[PDB]
Design an enzyme around this catalytic site. Sequence first.
Site, PDB file in Angstrom:
ATOM      1  N   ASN A  37     120.267 -15.887  62.249  1.00 29.53           N
ATOM      2  CA  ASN A  37     121.686 -15.517  62.268  1.00 29.53           C
ATOM      3  C   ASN A  37     122.463 -16.153  61.111  1.00 29.53           C
ATOM      4  O   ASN A  37     122.200 -17.309  60.778  1.00 29.53           O
ATOM      5  CB  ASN A  37     122.285 -16.011  63.582  1.00 29.53           C
ATOM      6  CG  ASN A  37     123.618 -15.349  63.901  1.00 29.53           C
ATOM      7  OD1 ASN A  37     123.835 -14.168  63.584  1.00 29.53           O
ATOM      8  ND2 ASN A  37     124.506 -16.098  64.559  1.00 29.53           N
ATOM      9  N   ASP A 107     116.016 -20.870  61.310  1.00 29.37           N
ATOM     10  CA  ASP A 107     117.101 -20.551  62.268  1.00 29.37           C
ATOM     11  C   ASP A 107     116.496 -19.778  63.465  1.00 29.37           C
ATOM     12  O   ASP A 107     115.473 -20.191  64.018  1.00 29.37           O
ATOM     13  CB  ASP A 107     118.177 -19.758  61.471  1.00 29.37           C
ATOM     14  CG  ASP A 107     119.482 -19.510  62.233  1.00 29.37           C
ATOM     15  OD1 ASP A 107     119.576 -18.496  62.949  1.00 29.37           O
ATOM     16  OD2 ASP A 107     120.452 -20.279  62.033  1.00 29.37           O
ATOM     17  N   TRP A 108     117.092 -18.658  63.868  1.00 27.40           N
ATOM     18  CA  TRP A 108     116.505 -17.871  64.956  1.00 27.40           C
ATOM     19  C   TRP A 108     115.147 -17.267  64.601  1.00 27.40           C
ATOM     20  O   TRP A 108     114.339 -16.956  65.490  1.00 27.40           O
ATOM     21  CB  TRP A 108     117.486 -16.804  65.410  1.00 27.40           C
ATOM     22  CG  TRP A 108     118.489 -17.379  66.331  1.00 27.40           C
ATOM     23  CD1 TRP A 108     119.818 -17.680  66.072  1.00 27.40           C
ATOM     24  CD2 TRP A 108     118.237 -17.777  67.674  1.00 27.40           C
ATOM     25  NE1 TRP A 108     120.399 -18.219  67.207  1.00 27.40           N
ATOM     26  CE2 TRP A 108     119.450 -18.289  68.200  1.00 27.40           C
ATOM     27  CE3 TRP A 108     117.095 -17.743  68.498  1.00 27.40           C
ATOM     28  CZ2 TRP A 108     119.548 -18.752  69.516  1.00 27.40           C
ATOM     29  CZ3 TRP A 108     117.195 -18.202  69.804  1.00 27.40           C
ATOM     30  CH2 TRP A 108     118.408 -18.705  70.300  1.00 27.40           C
ATOM     31  N   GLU A 131     115.110 -25.841  58.625  1.00 23.91           N
ATOM     32  CA  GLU A 131     116.376 -25.631  59.348  1.00 23.91           C
ATOM     33  C   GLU A 131     116.136 -24.754  60.579  1.00 23.91           C
ATOM     34  O   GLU A 131     116.750 -23.681  60.771  1.00 23.91           O
ATOM     35  CB  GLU A 131     117.471 -25.121  58.394  1.00 23.91           C
ATOM     36  CG  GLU A 131     118.060 -26.289  57.587  1.00 23.91           C
ATOM     37  CD  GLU A 131     118.848 -27.235  58.486  1.00 23.91           C
ATOM     38  OE1 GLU A 131     119.733 -26.731  59.214  1.00 23.91           O
ATOM     39  OE2 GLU A 131     118.570 -28.456  58.487  1.00 23.91           O
ATOM     40  N   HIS A 271     122.495 -25.700  55.824  1.00 26.05           N
ATOM     41  CA  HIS A 271     121.705 -24.882  56.757  1.00 26.05           C
ATOM     42  C   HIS A 271     120.964 -23.720  56.094  1.00 26.05           C
ATOM     43  O   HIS A 271     119.761 -23.553  56.296  1.00 26.05           O
ATOM     44  CB  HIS A 271     122.539 -24.358  57.925  1.00 26.05           C
ATOM     45  CG  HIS A 271     121.718 -23.637  58.948  1.00 26.05           C
ATOM     46  ND1 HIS A 271     120.676 -24.244  59.615  1.00 26.05           N
ATOM     47  CD2 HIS A 271     121.776 -22.367  59.415  1.00 26.05           C
ATOM     48  CE1 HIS A 271     120.129 -23.382  60.456  1.00 26.05           C
ATOM     49  NE2 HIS A 271     120.778 -22.234  60.354  1.00 26.05           N
TER      50      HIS A 271
HETATM   51 CL   LIG Z   1     123.330 -18.983  66.048  1.00 27.08          CL
END
Ligand SMILES: [Cl-]
Length: 294
Positions: A37, A107-108, A131, A271
Amino acid sequence: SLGAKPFGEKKFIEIKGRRMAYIDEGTGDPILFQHGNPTSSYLWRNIMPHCAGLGRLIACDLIGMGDSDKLDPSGPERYTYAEHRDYLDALWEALDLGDRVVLVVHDWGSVLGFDWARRHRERVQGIAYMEAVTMPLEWADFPEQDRDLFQAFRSQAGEELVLQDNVFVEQVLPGLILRPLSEAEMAAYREPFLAAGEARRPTLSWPRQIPIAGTPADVVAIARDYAGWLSESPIPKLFINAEPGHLTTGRIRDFCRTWPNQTEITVAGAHFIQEDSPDEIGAAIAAFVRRLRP
Ligand SMILES: [Cl-]
Ligand SMILES: [Ca+2]
Ligand SMILES: [Cl-]
């Protein structure tokens, strides 16, 4: 280098009655790059070139993101982790990946990729991550300055912030990149989310799914499962740490640093570190893959 041009040509495939978009370049064993995301395959555009000729370079757009179809009808119950997983599992099956896959995750993309790897462990040649959600989280793991905002996403305020005002794309994304983005780069990131309302739902459903302080219980269980597995798996790993970093710091970095058979480097970034250090990241992944594929 840097640059705003996408990598390769967008391809499309029908999955569960929807069209999903992806990049698929070259031949051989896949090197599978997975965004989270609120990004898309575009996140990897300056990284994938470093792996040219090392395998089949693949980067999928998650359902509702990038050039992938929106889920209609969209709403508060749509674009859960479980739903994303159903689409991504099916796309990865359709892509005929074989049994020596290198995963590169963020992330995701890391929740999805770590979970897929746990379930398909015999097919996973290596895992590069950065990350990433390395284990279930607690609010203390969450960067202090961003706690209130993420808490607000996970409240009734989230619809105004995200569906109406596009805060994840317009605020969080640049806020967690150290270098200024160009007009063309932000245009690429905002494109799937130009329209207010449900078009933006994935960028709100995602923060509502983060496994934090035991909720949502299903995603917590998934992350607990892969956390235990990764801490014991002998599959080669590449951990790309970031300075100052964002998510993968403190306790959850302390944890992933216990994972076996792991190489680590540190690059500059917060990030979305792919926008800050793409050459360092690409060079590290390419070196990892060369070692895995002599
Ligand atoms: Cl998120
Ligand atoms: Ca910034
Ligand atoms: Cl083979």
